[PDB]
Structure 1
Amino acid sequence: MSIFSNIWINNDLNSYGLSILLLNIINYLIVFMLILSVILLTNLSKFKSLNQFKEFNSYNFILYSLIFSLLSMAGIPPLLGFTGKFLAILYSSFKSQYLLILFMTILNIFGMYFYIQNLRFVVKKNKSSILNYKNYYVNINYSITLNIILLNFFNFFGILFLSDLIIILNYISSYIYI
């Protein structure tokens, strides 16, 4: 907001923090959906303790899907959760909140280790058998695998297409007159 002979100039978009908040919520929901789809594809009774993360030590698709989902939740740069965290920090800097940035970073790093430590448990002595048996054979669901694959693609390459999602979220939030 600048005044030059009673002419106001606004280089700030007020309906931007709300868009960033929506983006963070959507990114967390997407990553949560990815991990929960991986869980639902398998047998649910196996996973009952943090130690049981080793039970995810199954064929490459499930194993690496879990690994990348955990990393994305932690906030590792290339993955989806990093976009939300980075944009939150960027908006905090734009609003000039150094203390908020400090506390966000403390929480982020503590939560990052909280997510990462499970990768230690993911290691298993042998390959786990977590699939339900149907017709005497393990039941692998093509539909859930396809959904997990789309989620994996977007988790890996969200940064490339994030501009369109940001445009859409800002468009949605601009209707709010705040």
Structure 2
Amino acid sequence: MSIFSNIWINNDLNSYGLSILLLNIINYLIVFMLILSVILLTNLSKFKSLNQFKEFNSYNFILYSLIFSLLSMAGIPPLLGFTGKFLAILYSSFKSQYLLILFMTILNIFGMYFYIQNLRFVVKKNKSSILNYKNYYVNINYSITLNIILLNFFNFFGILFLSDLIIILNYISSYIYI
């Protein structure tokens, strides 16, 4: 935002921050959707306490998806969670907020520790049984499995496709002040 001979040149986009907040909220909501998706595919009465995380030790797809979602919640790379924290840090640096950067880093470290503390209770001595039984046999929702697969695909490798979402969010935020 400099002025040269009464003609100004702007190299900054004022709508980037709103798009950044929207993308962070969207990523958090998407992670929460997959986090609760596994709960929806199991007997929701079998997961009560924090130590009741070994109930996730089941058929390999459930365990792998749960581990990936737990990692994504803490924002570790290269899941969708790391994208939000990295973009927030980049925006804060672009706004020259060193104290805010330090506080965000401390908070992210504390959150990573809290989220990873649950991974300790993941191990179980044997395969668990948290699936509801229909017609005398355990019922697995194929539609829920497909939704969880799509979410896991968009989280594990969705970092490469971040360009289109970022462009869409920037376009949305462009008319916020216009």
Q: Same fold (TM over 0.5)?
A: yes
Distance across 2 between alignment mates of 1:138 and 1:159: 35
1:32 Cα shift? 0.3
Distance across 2 between alignment mates of 1:106 and 1:140: 40
TM-score scaled by structure 1?
A: 0.99
Runs of 4+ in 1 over 6 A off after TM superposition: none
Distance across 1 between alignment mates of 2:78 and 2:4: 43
1:67 Cα shift? 0.4
Q: Secondary structure at the match of 2:177?
A: coil
Distance across 2 between alignment mates of 1:105 and 1:72: 16
Distance across 2 between alignment mates of 1:3 and 1:134: 71
1:151 Cα shift? 0.0
Aligned residues: 178
Task: Point out where structure 2 has 5 or more consecutive residues left out of the alignment.
Answer: none
Q: Deviations over 1:39-74 (max 9, x none)?
A: 100010000001110000001110011100000000
Identity of aligned residues (%): 100
1:164 Cα shift? 0.5
Task: Point out where structure 1 has 5 or more consecutive residues left out of the alignment.
Answer: none
Distance across 1 between alignment mates of 2:80 and 2:60: 21
Q: Deviations over 1:129-160 (max 9, x none)?
A: 00001101000000000000000000011211
Q: Deviations over 1:59-93 (max 9, x none)?
A: 11100111000000001111010000000000000
Q: Secondary structure at the match of 1:153?
A: helix
Structure with the bigger percentage of helix: 1
